[model samples]
Target chain A: PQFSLWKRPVVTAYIEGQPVEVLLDTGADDSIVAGIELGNNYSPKIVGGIGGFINTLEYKNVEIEVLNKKVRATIMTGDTPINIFGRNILTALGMSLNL
Target chain B: PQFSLWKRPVVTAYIEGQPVEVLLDTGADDSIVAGIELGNNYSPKIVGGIGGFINTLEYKNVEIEVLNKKVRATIMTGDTPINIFGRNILTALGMSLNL
Candidate 1:
């Protein structure tokens, strides 16, 4: 799965049987999804990036399907323009950036 | 390059002939470096991420060397934990994410 740098590296992912477009963010440490009801069981966390920091809900052990493979990941719920598929899932899928 | 998600995808890059380690951040739109002086000609801009937004100085048409190839990119100066090699340079180098 080769992605162009001209645009975001967005890919289709199935989270708990629901399909959504997620950006492959190598800068993010954890995967994050918005407007999804995973469960009430979540831990409050502070996630930081190039900007600053934001309070988020960390939902651990969530299952998601990417590139036809199912992976268990720690998905976070936060205020973002789009869902982020971060290193937590990219590492599980053995994905890498190539030149 | 095959990078591990366990850690940041940090790679050595030459910016204006100075070598530095930069994170390959697909989430970032422009490349950024800290503690480097590329002259005073820059434009003020705001860059946002999952956390929030921050003010930065944009340096246009900066030359950088990655994988022995020279690429002209828009490099920004900001307060970041580390230097970021973003899509602006990645796109110019024809880099991609692979599974």
Candidate 2:
């Protein structure tokens, strides 16, 4: 099915063995998981957005599974309340963002 | 040819006669243009991202051309320095994002 950009392409996936629904964001440079506590295996960084500089986060590797494809991805940990599967996982899962 | 999410899929387009290259962003709910100031053809709204909330902007209709297809898209005007072509224009251009 053709998904509308007006609507986020939310797909069910596993993060650390937990079932989660994530937005397939081609625009996001890195993946993000808000409100989740991550380990010390991370680095501090920031991302730019239309509004301004977004939250500073701990960039770390997380294990995720989507559509029978599982891989570890670089993600930013924060408290924003939205789970996003950005380009890091999308391309690794063989998803192609066309234009 | 295959496109990678590691690199933004930027395409050439005309915005009110100005040629520009925009990132094909799916994560963004609405399209955004940084730096150029626009007129009173928009509404005020805020968009959230990984970092934090972005700048509030006036949402308005604008003329844009991509892949020989012209479209009127609702865009958020700001001064972020990067031009993004969200899903609003891609489907109009008849482009497919395959997973």
Candidate 3:
């Protein structure tokens, strides 16, 4: 296990309409989605981060529905989470990386 | 309702000696537990944190065997967002928080 983000393919995905299963993090840079009751439509939208120490947020781009393909993302909220779908929705699922 | 580390009662706590199962955080001034496998002896001597963010590790007193209770802790590691032992370890059994 490469650990700390390298987990690929998590089954269910959809937000605002609800359904969950996320993790395609390439050490995440922007691509996160959630709304499995940890709701707020993928929440976040800045709430303290970067050098301040923990507690962060930033989301607002909505509309995600992977696999059936319907992507547009925004999610990065914290306080050391429990539901990760990070990287603004995995680059909107344009997805590519194989070397 | 008051999330972000208010999880108390984690059934196994042993470190600096090695055994695993933890989570008795009063909003974590400093304490954690994970070593069933995801190793590094609670691994987190701070490789990167505070806003540049995540990729953290810090563990020094690795002996966990909760329900046996042997406290001497210093852990604030990171990257772990879920593995909550059926409601955050149900309080290692010293559980008592009613308000």
Strongest candidate by DockQ: 1
Q: Which stretches of candidate 2 lie over 4 Å from their true place?
A: A1-6, A54-61, B54-59
lDDT string for model 3 (B1-99, tens) is: 121111222344444466555433222223433333334665544422224444446655434445555544345445544212211222332332221
Ranking by lDDT: 1, 2, 3
Model 1 ranges off by over 4 Å: none
Screening candidate 1 with a backbone cut-off below 3 angstroms (N, C-alpha, C), the clashing residue pairs are: none
Extract clashing residue pairs from model 2: A51-B54, A51-B55, A54-B51, A54-B52, A55-B51, A55-B52, B43-B59
Docking class of 3: incorrect
lDDT of 3 by residue, A37-70 (tens): 4444543444322223444445567677867778
Candidate that beats the other on DockQ, 1 or 2, i.e. the better one: 1
Report the TM-score measured on chain A for model 3: 0.28
Model 1, A24-89: lDDT tens per residue? 988777888887888989999888777677777988888898888889889888887678888889
Q: What is the interface RMSD of candidate 1, in Å?
A: 1.6
Task: List each model's interface RMSD.
Answer: 1.6, 2.7, 15.2
Worst 10 residues of 1 chain A by lDDT: A47-56
- The DockQ for candidate 3, computed on C-alphas, is 0.07
TM-score evaluated only on chain B, model 2: 0.79
